[PDB]
Amino acid sequence: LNPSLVISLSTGLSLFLGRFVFFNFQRENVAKQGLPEQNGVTHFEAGDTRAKEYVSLLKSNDPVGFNIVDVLAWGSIGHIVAYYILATSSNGYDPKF
Amino acid sequence: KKGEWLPGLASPGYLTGSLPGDNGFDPLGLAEDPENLKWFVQAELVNGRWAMLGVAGMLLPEVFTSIGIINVPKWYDAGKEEYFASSSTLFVIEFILFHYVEIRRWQDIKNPGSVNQDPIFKQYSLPAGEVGYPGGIFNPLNFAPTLEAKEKEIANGRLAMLAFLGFIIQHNVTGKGPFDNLLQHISDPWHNTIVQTL
Amino acid sequence: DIAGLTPCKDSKQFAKREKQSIKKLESSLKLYAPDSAPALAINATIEKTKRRFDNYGKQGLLCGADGLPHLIVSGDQRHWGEFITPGILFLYIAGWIGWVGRSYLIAIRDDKKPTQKEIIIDVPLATGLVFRGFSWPIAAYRELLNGELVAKDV
Amino acid sequence: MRDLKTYLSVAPVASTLWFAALAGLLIEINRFFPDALTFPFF
Amino acid sequence: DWMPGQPRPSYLDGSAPGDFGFDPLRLGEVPENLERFKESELIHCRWAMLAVPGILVPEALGLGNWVKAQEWAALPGGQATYLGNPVPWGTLPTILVIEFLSIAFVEHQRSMEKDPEKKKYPGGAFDPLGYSKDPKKFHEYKIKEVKNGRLALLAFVGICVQQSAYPGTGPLENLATHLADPWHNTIGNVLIP
Ligand code: CLA
Ligand code: CLA
Ligand code: CLA
Ligand code: CLA
Ligand SMILES: CC(/C=C/C=C(C)/C=C/[C@@]12O[C@]1(C)C[C@@H](O)CC2(C)C)=C\C=C\C=C(C)\C=C\C=C(C)\C=C\[C@@]12O[C@]1(C)C[C@@H](O)CC2(C)C
Ligand SMILES: CC1=C[C@H](O)CC(C)(C)[C@H]1/C=C/C(C)=C/C=C/C(C)=C/C=C/C=C(C)/C=C/C=C(C)/C=C/C1=C(C)C[C@H](O)CC1(C)C
Ligand SMILES: CC1=C(/C=C/C(C)=C/C=C/C(C)=C\C=C/C=C(C)/C=C/C=C(C)/C=C/C2=C(C)CCCC2(C)C)C(C)(C)CCC1
Question: Is residue E5 part of a domain?
């Protein structure tokens, strides 16, 4: 009901989960999937200028390697959850048994 | 001569006069394969034994109740008379019990001697007879399962299957019991046929 | 009823069609004589019409607003006479034809000049083969279990 | 006479006879049981 | 053997706890599939072994059957009740969130191990009385556990099918209905209605 309460609760829970529960599993899956390749090499090594990873902002001072991109992804996961909860908790909808 | 179902017609090469009842009859080439024949012999024996039990239990109650000893219904009616239990209950019991015994028979056809011994008591097995002829406990009177008596068996079974065919077509075209049918043909026969029935 | 169709015995439209057709016939009849052969033919046709309509009444068929009979092929048990039992009959006869044909083909395939027996039939051989179709289901079953129906390595 | 028996089993004649007999059979069936839309027996 | 007189699979000899040679669909024809299937079997068996007392006991008590006890949730003013006392945190959404967080944590914890013998028998902090003493009573305990688990799964699916046959009933109401007229209240009445 109280919007900002629920909003930050859902966001903080999502970010905590991303940093402390799935951070390893996710890093492992990203490692094993890797960068997209065309004809055997990545997109940069075939001559695509605009397709070079952004090494600059990805590096981070976290102890484990959480950065801006993980924050954006998991935080918005939390936001989408919060808005679903708000909308259907105030929509007055009722099924029947 | 191992018997001819047609005194002019020659045998088929795949029938050897080995199994009982061999009279050399298979015009439609159903068993020109040895595996087919091994399966069909078994089916014939078992269908015949069921037909024997069925026709006896169909017909003998009729004459027993028709010269006044017990009052039983007709076979094409007896399924309707109410019993101590539902017909659904009896059907489910029948299904489970026949499940068990038919899969046991199955494994013995597939692999003789492998389902012989009791699964509860590790003693009390069966001796090593043949497939289609499980003696032992199933043969308390210890009758000699000789060649003469197997031909007896399969002949009674074949005639019983034909008797069953008769009973059912009879009931569906005329509408009463087979003893009704018989005697009502018996006394005045030359006007009591399938022709006047049709 | 099923799909909104009411019974042809209870259908007014079904009756209307019957009597309309009957008396159209009988209007065409009132000529040539009251006993000449054309009149006899027309009266036979009238009686056949009555028999047809009454038989469709007996058999419990479903009629619509058109007044004509409809067919239910869904599997409902009140209507197996419509599709499923004639369907079983058809599948049996068709398998009979095809089975006899395949066994003839197989029987002649080892001849020195097989084409000679394709454009000129061996009638005694076919006469021996025609009646195996009577048990084609059982044979085809034991031929499938045998690994004998499908040409291996094709 | 044997040559005639062979000739009578050539493809067009054999099919002609087969289908004429089949036609007679279906024609007579429909002359006995006319206007069938269902299997009215069982 | 699950079928006396029936040849065994090649890959199923009879050493594993519960191997009776039953795999007619050869789904364990690949070894790295069979390992996952063993761990999966034990997980299902353990869940059902814990569940069926949770389905029988409170109905044998003075409470509602396993379906009735999960019906407040579909009404707006929902409120649970344990042992006939209104659960304070009984509303649906708090329960859904708490269930999610806890179960996700423990189940991912389970996923993060690679023994693969620990995957089905971890032990340690999960074997307090130390019944893993001897490797011969240990194998015996394994067999008895797996056997009871298959029995439990059988009984849970039986509960579900009896539920969908008599909607709005409990298992013990079914047993009472059957002991009230044995020769008349049986499965026939739901297979030939
Ligand atoms: C094989 C055993 C058998 C026996 C002993 C009988 C006996 C009898 N049948 Mg029946 N019947 C049988 C089989 C049998 N049937 C079969 C398999 C069918 C299905 C086609 C029928 C269909 C049938 C009908 C529709 C009717 C009878 C009727 C009758 C009675 C009148 C006689 C008659 O019309 O002949 C039987 C007519 C037939 C078409 C069947 C012919 C039997 C064939 C030839 C096989 C039997 C031959 C066998 C080797 C010789 C008899 C055994 C003997 C040596 C002991 C009679 C008591 C009539 C009746 O009851 O009167 C009201 C009648 O309504 N039967
Ligand atoms: C397109 C979807 C669909 C399908 C696939 C079916 C299918 C079926 N419906 Mg259904 N139905 C449908 C939609 C459908 N329905 C809808 C939308 C409705 C609402 C109106 C219904 C309402 C409905 C009702 C009310 C009923 C069905 C029933 C049935 C069954 C009847 C046929 C049968 O009994 O088997 C076949 C019958 C046989 C006797 C089997 C013999 C066939 C032989 C074995 C095959 C022949 C092969 C060859 C000749 C020999 C083999 C040779 C081989 C060895 C090589 C069938 C399986 C009936 C049912 O429940 O069945 C009891 C029934 O009562 N349906
Ligand atoms: C999902 C639960 C589950 C799982 C994962 C397993 C897994 C395994 N079982 Mg087990 N089992 C179970 C339940 C289960 N079982 C139940 C309920 C019983 C009692 C009936 C048994 C009784 C049993 C015996 C006696 C034996 C095994 C054996 C095995 C092992 C080899 C078989 C195999 O590889 O198939 C893999 C399993 C699957 C791929 C799951 C199949 C799911 C399919 C696709 C759907 C099932 C449909 C089903 C009919 C649903 C009905 C619902 C309702 C409508 C009735 C394997 C590790 C054999 C073994 O060697 O032990 C080590 C053996 O001896 N099981
Ligand atoms: C038929 C019941 C049963 C049996 C025989 C076993 C047997 C076994 N378990 Mg297991 N377990 C079970 C149920 C069972 N479990 C259930 C329901 C769960 C939770 C879903 C677990 C979870 C579990 C884990 C996580 C582990 C084991 C382990 C083991 C193995 C070593 C422990 C041991 O030997 O103790 C012997 C077993 C018994 C003495 C069974 C008697 C216990 C009675 C029945 C307790 C009464 C239950 C109670 C009345 C019901 C309500 C309680 C509820 C509120 C909790 C062993 C083969 C450990 C292992 O593999 O070690 C390496 C392992 O780590 N189990
Ligand atoms: C199983 C059977 C009968 C069983 C009946 C039973 C149990 C009756 C049971 C009950 O009565 C009770 C006790 C009590 C009642 O209240 C209820 C019912 C339920 C009524 C008959 C089979 C009967 C089976 C029959 C008739 C088989 C026919 C086979 C034929 C004709 C084959 C011939 C050929 O195959 C050859 C040999 C060679 C080929 O080349 C050519 C052809 C011609 C194909
Ligand atoms: C196993 C053993 C071992 C141990 O050790 C010992 C012991 C115990 C002894 C044993 C047992 C055995 C047994 C069981 C036997 C049985 C048999 C039978 C039942 C037969 C029948 C059998 C039966 C049969 C054939 C039948 C037949 C029938 C018939 C013909 C009929 C006819 C008819 C008809 C159609 C119709 C009409 O209307 C009527 C008439 C005319 C009449
Ligand atoms: C410094 C630090 C810290 C802190 C941290 C923090 C504080 C965090 C965060 C964070 C966050 C807080 C994040 C967030 C968010 C994000 C995002 C990214 C979002 C989103 C959203 C979206 C994207 C969407 C929306 C929407 C729309 C727009 C429309 C409608 C609805 C929806 C929902 C769809 C600590 C001390 C702890 C540790 C050390 C370091």
Answer: no
Domains and CATH numbers, chain D: 1-42 (1.20.5.510)
Contact C125, D11 (CB under 8 A): no
**Helix-helix angle C37-58:C12-29, to 10 degrees:** 170
What domains sit in chain B, N to C, each tagged with a CATH number?
A: 34-187 (1.10.3460.10)
DSSP string, chain C: -GGGPEETTT-HHHHHHHHHHHHHHHHHHSSS-SSSHHHHHHHHHHHHHHHHHHHHHHTT-EE-SSSSEE---S--GGGTTTTHHHHHHHHHHHHHHHHHHHHHHHHHTTSSSTTHHHHB--HHHHHHHGGGGGGHHHHHHHHHHTT-SSPS--
Ligand 2 first shell, C-beta below 6 A? C 74-77, 88, 91-92, 95, 137, 140-141
Which strands sit side by side in the sheet containing C6-7, from one edge to the other? Answer: C6-7, C62-63, C69-70
Does the annotation flag B104 for ligand binding?
A: no
In chain C, which residue's Cα lies nearest the Cα of B37? C142
Deposited experimental method: cryo-EM
Q: How many CB pairs under 8 A join B and C?
A: 16
The amino acid occupying position A56 is S
**How many angstroms does the Cα of residue A89 sit away from the middle of ligand 7?**
22
Domain that includes residue E118, residue range: 31-190
The closest of E75, E67, E92 to A96, measured between CA atoms, is: E75
Closest alpha carbon within chain B to E189: B88
Resolution (A): 2.5
> Which residues fall within 8 angstroms of residue A64, CB to CB, at 6 or more apart?
A19, A23
Q: Do E5 and B85 touch (CB under 8 A)?
A: no
Angle, vertex CA E91, rays to CA E90 and CA E95, nearest 5: 80
Look at C55 and D35 and tell me if their CB atoms are within 8 Å: yes
- Answer yes or no: is E17 within a domain: no
Q: DSSP assignment, residue E76?
A: T
Write down the H helix ranges in chain A: 3-20, 23-33, 55-58, 68-90
**Domain count across chain E:** 1
Rounded Cα distance between B17 and B1, Å, is 9
CATH number of the domain within which E121 lies: 1.10.3460.10
Calculate helix-pair angle for B147-173, B34-66, nearest 10 degrees.
60
Q: In angstroms, rounded to a whole number, what is the distance separating the alpha carbons of residues B94 and B88?
A: 10
E54 within a domain of the structure (yes/no):
yes
Q: Give the helix/strand (H/E) hosting A42.
A: strand A41-42
**Residue boundaries of the structural domains of chain A:** 1-97
Q: Is residue E155 part of a domain?
A: yes
